[PDB]
């Protein structure tokens, strides 16, 4: 009974408006097929779906990468298998070649063919490549990404395999083999004669090969060869040049000989620490509880270890370091007596030094071996070796008690005894002695055999190469099995995660068709009731009778 | 008969007003489709509908959660199946390798592949994940919400599965396999404490393991192991028992220690040459340029080296040896002064001897090493080794400068530095040090591996590991079926509750359309009767006749 200013059709319109959102959402949900289409839905679901999608894509790419790794491992394994076949053939040839019934032509032919197959192995090692990467040319590792998160990879170990790595660097089966050596040749013994015969046997004559006097450098090599020997010398370069003390003993412990000397170097620091005309050395000086780092050059200015800081000596009565003192300029000469008075130390890397008075007392010097030999090659010394004492006085073998053996220094010359029957034996009694032989190198070596230039133990070396290649092949096989397992895992995981993500997205149409029917029926009923509502007002017109 | 002041239409308007509310309610109900739209209807019904709606939504979301739990269980089960297959292959390989017809190379290959697959098991254990959650990395539990009200959950048990948990920590069938060692374990360092920190770093504390003082016998094996060392000792058995001279130095050259001593053994030959109570030793005596062979027993009769010839000492004025002399009987005491006066030698195999006066001068003695060690185990000596000097005074490590390292004697004790972060390093600066480890043996070795003898009953251990993983698989299966049953129950319950809530809301349209029709018809009737009511009054105007 009101003029449309309180009409009830507004309620119907509002209800239709409330329905329209559900209608639109239902139709759109049918169209997409995914429950979550924008942030208006459960945004947490959207984020979880996005994370799941990223995981699934990364997992699939990782699976493809693992397959690629399997392929590269397969190529490498095939190459290794044929290399193994070649090595087995070479071993078979070597087994053939060991028989003594073969002429030098036969051995040469076998060597030619073996060299051919070794070059074949080298070639196939260099040749094999997989997409610009040489599998067998370098001892690297290859990382295979099979996981979604960074840092999770599988490593394939690759070794450089060739003739050098497998060994034998030229198998060389064709060298001149086992050869019998020639006899004693009594006439060749032109050494010093002596009928001493300490056993008194009338039928033996002792021959000594003199002129084997070792040189001084030989003495130095002998002492340097062994570790832990003793050498006493005077008149050394740098330290010991005044030679106030003679017994230094140089304390050879592990490496280039050390030393120990009393107050002798006071002015020799520049000569020692600066071998050349412009050398400068780092050193550490402390007064006691005050560790300061300094540079020493030609016994001149004690330049501070800073970039360009220059230290000045000051503090008369204390004699410490200060960059900004107000007295005379610092030099090594006076700081020597300063340290002697204050009982400090100036120890450096190549020698720990202290002073009492006006001269440095060396403690733990360490002179270079080559320089030491160059300095004392022509002076007197009593260098000793294990359980032996050797004397040298301004000339090699002053006492004439050092003799050069085959390769070692001995106090006794090579003694050769000549027997009555023309043989030469190392000892008087023929029951012992191992009658000496001659041949192919001189020096009258006491063996019946000359070294054969062929490979020493060919079969063992070839079996070692076979073992190496088979270990490599086993490594590749284990890696291949592990990658196959990784692929199976990653497939199962990506399937499960795909279903998981499907449970969050991907709205069930079974519910959505019924929801659409709801929305459409409500919309139709609402529009019709809106019509029925707006057909009401004209009753007031009917009342007016106009 | 009244002019609108007692109007008869008022009841008509009032009745139309009453029915208008019903008409509007019917139209609105038809538009919405729900029986209750606001509190004007049965409010208790509205509250009940709200509660049912909340319950239905909660149950649906719980069903989705249950599905997610099923998916994660499936992924875990797949990973466990892969691990189980790997373990089966390990068992098969172990059964193969138990046979005694195999060489060390075959065992090496088998152990290599077993180790490879064990590392594969560990990798698949570590890298398996479900949406940022590692199922097999911890012994945790995951709660799945399947109910509408808080606290109603289902728990899934997860166990940490890896090579450590299953046991055997390196299956190690071949031998010389590797097991991981433990960490620094700062708390175990019970050695002597020293905050000295020579580098001055505040955060470093130096710990030294004291009580590592080597015994004197340890020094003896230390000196004896190396060849050519120096040992200075007095108060020795036999030679040096009077200890007239102290600096012997024992001249170790190649083997059991030698010696060099002045005239001290004059009467000590009987004890020294005859360690037991009746021993006899052969000897060679020469009065110069002319050798004679003799036997010595307890300094008594100088029996000739013949079968039974007995030598007596003779020749006053020359002091010769005659097997047919004509003077008094021979004793070593008398021949001692004979040789001392006449400058002869009695050099033997185990010692070169001469005498001047009435006492023998030893030159090239050779004492047995074991007898030496037993003799000087509890006396003062200053034995030295390569470039080192050691002092002992009536007791092991008198100077307290001897410390027993891992296997060698060093002048410095074992130095361990503990870092601020709880790590223990061999050096103060963390850049170096090779952070120390422990494990399986103590002694704090700087190794990541400690050996382990193969196993006891390998197949039993593999079987127990299989049983563990199989039990885990069964547990996951029981839980997974649990969740399937829960999903079925939730679906049935939410369907029933949805049908329940629908029966309270959702007004029957069958009665509602009839209500609309009745309201509309009665409304038109009311409007028309209102018009007819308004058509009545003008009969009074008809009365007025104007």
Numbering used by the authors:
A (entry chain B), B (entry chain A): 3 to 548
Source paper text:
A 6.7 Å resolution volume was reconstructed asymmetrically where all flagellin subunits could be fitted into the density. Analysis of this low-resolution structure revealed the seam, which involves the lack of D2 dimer formation between two flagellin subunits. This seam is a consequence of a reduction of symmetry along the 9-start helices of a flagellar filament composed of dimeric flagellin such as EHEC H7. The two outer domain subunits in the seam still form Sn:Sn + 22 dimers in domain D4. However, rather than forming an Sn:Sn + 6 or Sn:Sn + 11 dimer in domain D2, the two-seam subunits form Sn:Sn + 5 dimers with each other similar to those forming the EHEC H7 and the Achromobacter ODSs. In the non-helical perturbation model, subunit pairing introduced a seam causing a discontinuity in the helical lattice, much as such a seam or discontinuity exists in microtubules.
